[PDB]
Design a protein around this ligand. Structure first.
Ligand SMILES: O=C(O)[C@@]1(O)C[C@H](O)[C@@H](O)[C@H]([C@H](O)[C@H](O)CO)O1
Ligand SMILES: O=C(O)[C@@]1(O)C[C@H](O)[C@@H](O)[C@H]([C@H](O)[C@H](O)CO)O1
Ligand SMILES: O=N[O-]
Ligand code: NA
Length: 385
């Protein structure tokens, strides 16, 4: 039995990061605009304010080149981001240089310090190499040199997201030596019942211990982990990694504690097309719930489905509800990376990528990000479960 099913279903949805092709495209106050927005992350702070982050991809939808880390906040701590007018204009966390600032992975600490882990690479490097930049420059492949590797940066805010520190490079401390490619998140980290922070990253968790907003960091290496991971604390208090697979098929799941994890294995209940997903601890009292969101397809990113598990170890999720049951118009084809938070008014708030697909899979396809709010009742009253 879930009493939430008896509440009135609630949903609303609208574009929050508007690509350059849309009416009223999102630009910074400096006039700097963006072809595409990708790679969402969202958190609710301890005040109730919502912070939404994304990669502002300047010139194309590509993963490399000039990409800035951008964000929006709710105007007040109490408005819950319910309508477009509730959100501030686009701001920038970091945009220095013509390199890539991305993979936003925020976590809100107990003191309300908001930590934001990020990945960086140089202006003339790309994951595969030999990619053509807008000016015709051909990229070098990301490699293990200081200049050519993926870095891990940390910034934080002490004023509810209003301002951000200059990002500090933590690569030598928190990325293993000899690495070339790297990734943190993207999506979110968590705070455990026992007080530690856990931030998911490629092949590892980053663990924060000690005083809120003055944490010491260490690395928990994980055998079999993916590049793009998610982390949740399940109702049993254990840790749960749910990672993007290297090949299309299913989410890769492992369970553990701060002392170690077991093996990663595909979750046959969670089809995935090799794309990022998101996971969220909703509540701990009966009935305890974990929420999961991804594209529920072995092939397509356009099958977004939000689900609930009542299991103490999140063994099984229900069918849930397709996001297309509450479709957004005028913002392209919804589907891709996502991020979820709980809102101050007992809703789930989700950011979800969308793709106009005007250039197909090509670099000129405009990408936007949708903001959704829905309650548990909305999920539970879905026509397929
Ligand atoms: O939309 C994707 O699939 C994407 O390209 C977007 C990300 O910007 C990129 O960092 C990531 C990466 O390429 C894979 O995780 C393989 O390492 O995937
Ligand atoms: O379901 C997919 O994957 C799709 O076919 C349709 C999506 O709307 C689009 O975002 C995506 C993307 O172009 C590729 O994943 C490579 O970037 O292509
Ligand atoms: O610091 N490894 O739990
Ligand atoms: Na930049």
């Amino acid at each position: 039995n879930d009493p939430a099913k008896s509440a009135a279903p609630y949903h609303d949805e609208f574009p929050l990061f508007r690509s350059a092709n849309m009416a009223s495209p999102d630009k910074l106050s400096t006039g700097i605009g963006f072809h595409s927005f990708r790679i969402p992350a969202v958190v609710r702070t301890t005040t109730g304010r919502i912070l939404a982050f994304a990669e502002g991809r300047r010139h194309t939808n590509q993963d490399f080149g000039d990409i800035n880390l951008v964000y929006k906040r709710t105007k007040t701590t109490a408005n819950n981001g319910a309508s477009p007018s509730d959100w501030e204009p686009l701001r920038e966390v970091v945009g220095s240089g013509a390199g890539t600032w991305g993979n936003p992975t925020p976590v809100v600490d107990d003191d309300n310090t908001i930590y934001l882990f990020l990945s960086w690479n140089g202006a003339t490097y790309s994951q595969n190499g030999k990619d053509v930049l807008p000016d015709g420059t051909v990229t070098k492949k990301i490699d293990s040199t200081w200049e050519g590797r993926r870095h891990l940066y940390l910034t934080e805010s002490r004023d509810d997201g209003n301002t951000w520190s200059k990002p500090v490079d933590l690569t030598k401390e928190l990325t293993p030596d000899g690495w070339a490619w790297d990734a943190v998140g993207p999506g979110n980290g968590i705070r455990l019942t026992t007080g530690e922070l856990v931030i998911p990253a490629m092949g590892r968790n980053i663990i924060g211990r000690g005083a809120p907003g003055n944490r010491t960091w260490s690395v928990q290496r994980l055998s079999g982990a993916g590049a793009e991971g998610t982390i949740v604390q399940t109702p049993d208090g254990k840790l749960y990694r749910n990672d993007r697979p290297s090949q299309k098929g299913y989410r890769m799941v492992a369970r553990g504690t701060l002392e170690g994890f077991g093996a990663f294995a595909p979750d046959a209940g969670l089809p995935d097309p090799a794309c990022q997903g998101s996971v969220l601890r909703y509540n701990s009292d009966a009935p305890a719930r974990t929420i999961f969101l991804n594209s529920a397809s072995g092939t397509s990113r356009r099958a977004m489905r939000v689900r609930i598990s009542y299991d103490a170890d999140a063994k099984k999720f229900n069918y849930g509800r397709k996001l297309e049951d509450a479709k957004v118009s005028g913002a392209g084809h919804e589907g891709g990376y996502s991020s979820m938070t709980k809102t101050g008014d007992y809703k789930i708030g989700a950011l979800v990528e969308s793709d106009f697909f005007n250039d197909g899979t090509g670099k000129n396809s405009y990408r936007a990000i949708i903001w959704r709010r829905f309650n548990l009742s909305w999920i539970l009253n879905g026509p397929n479960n």
